[model samples]
Target: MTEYKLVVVGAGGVGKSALTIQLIQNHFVDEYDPTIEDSYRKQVVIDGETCLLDILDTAGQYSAMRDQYMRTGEGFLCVFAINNTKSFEDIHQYREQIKRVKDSDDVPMVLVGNKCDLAARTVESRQAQDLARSEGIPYIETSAKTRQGVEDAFYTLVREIRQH
Candidate 1:
């Protein structure tokens, strides 16, 4: 079995950890539990091949440790809150930094629009899709609160890594 090192990055309150926990533990977080940094491990079968996922749910704020994990991450989930435009705008920085740290523009990544359960969406679906299209990455809308599209979000990332 292969082990994939996946990293999740986004602005604060965008539910980065929620999406990760939802995928690994099969539960939703209804509370605001800010994450500093956490590592998770899970074994699963992706496309009939057994694989292990080593996920790193990274801190939202600026930190010196950002480069270290970005350096080692095999695939990345660049997440943003659909209800928050600021978070959506911050995606550029996250993507750029990840590519910078990895020293490759072809690094595998998935652009995620989270908090899709909320009716009020500041970041439109088409807007995110356009960005993802331009970046040549897969785009998924997920609601960590409802566990909607959470599995696809992570699974697609694993596929992206495999293809890359």
Candidate 2:
């Protein structure tokens, strides 16, 4: 069996926990929420292969801790809220810092556009796609509330990490 350390990172309120909780709990949050740090893990089977997907449902609130998450993760899911442009812009920093901290240009990462169920998307999907293309990574849209496109965003990254 293969084990993977996957970090869900981005600006706050970008659905890191929402996506994670849904995957782990099989349902979205209606009210109340979990804590802010020290994430949890769950077993996930991708393509008939079992793997331990250890996830950090954390925020990029602190630079030092964010840098640590960037360095430690075997694979990363860089998330952004489509309704918030600043969150989208912040993703570049995470990618750059991951490269710098890991000292490698080609890091195992993916760009995820969360909150697609929300109205008024400031960041379009095409714009995200172009950015991911430039960075040589995959881009996906997910809605934690509606449970749309969530599995694809996660499973795709798992496939990428396992393949290489």
Candidate 3:
């Protein structure tokens, strides 16, 4: 069995935990307490193959937790709220942090624009895609509430890791 360490990172309330929960447990939290400090783990089977998925669903805006979470990740998913343009703009800082901590340009990553159900409030999906392209990472729009593209965003990185 392949073992994977996946970290879901982003500013608070961007839906990292929500997406993780939906993917790992097939459940979504509509009214989650963002102030809570916690992380969860689970095993996931993709394409009939089992893998141990160690997920670090983190609070990026919280200084203490953010510092701790970034230090111990193998791969990352930089999640941003679709309706929040500021969160999109903050991806650079997140990428820089990842580079600083992981110390590798080849570190696997996926740029996730979450909360796609709010398309009317979305900033620019094309911009996110272009940024991901320039950064050499895969990109996808996901919705934890509706569970859209959640699995693909995760397994894409897993598959990429398997390739190398």
Best by lDDT: 1
TM-score of model number 3: 0.90
lDDT of 1 at 147: 95
Candidate 1 on 33-66: residue-level lDDT in tens? 8888899999999899999999999989756689
Ranking by lDDT: 1, 2, 3
Ranking by TM-score: 1, 2, 3
Number of colliding residue pairs in each model: 0, 0, 0
Instruction: Residues 53-135, candidate 2: write the lDDT tens digits.
Output: 88887765667766777778888899999999999999888788888989987777889999899889899889999999998
TM-score each candidate: 0.97, 0.93, 0.90
Judge candidate 1 against the unseen true structure and give its global Cα lDDT, from 0 to 1. Answer: 0.93
Comparing 1 and 2 on lDDT, the stronger one: 1
Give stretches of model 1 more than 4 Å off. none
Q: Highest TM-score among the candidates is held by which one? A: 1
All models: lDDT?
0.93, 0.85, 0.82
Model 1: which residue pairs collide?
Answer: none
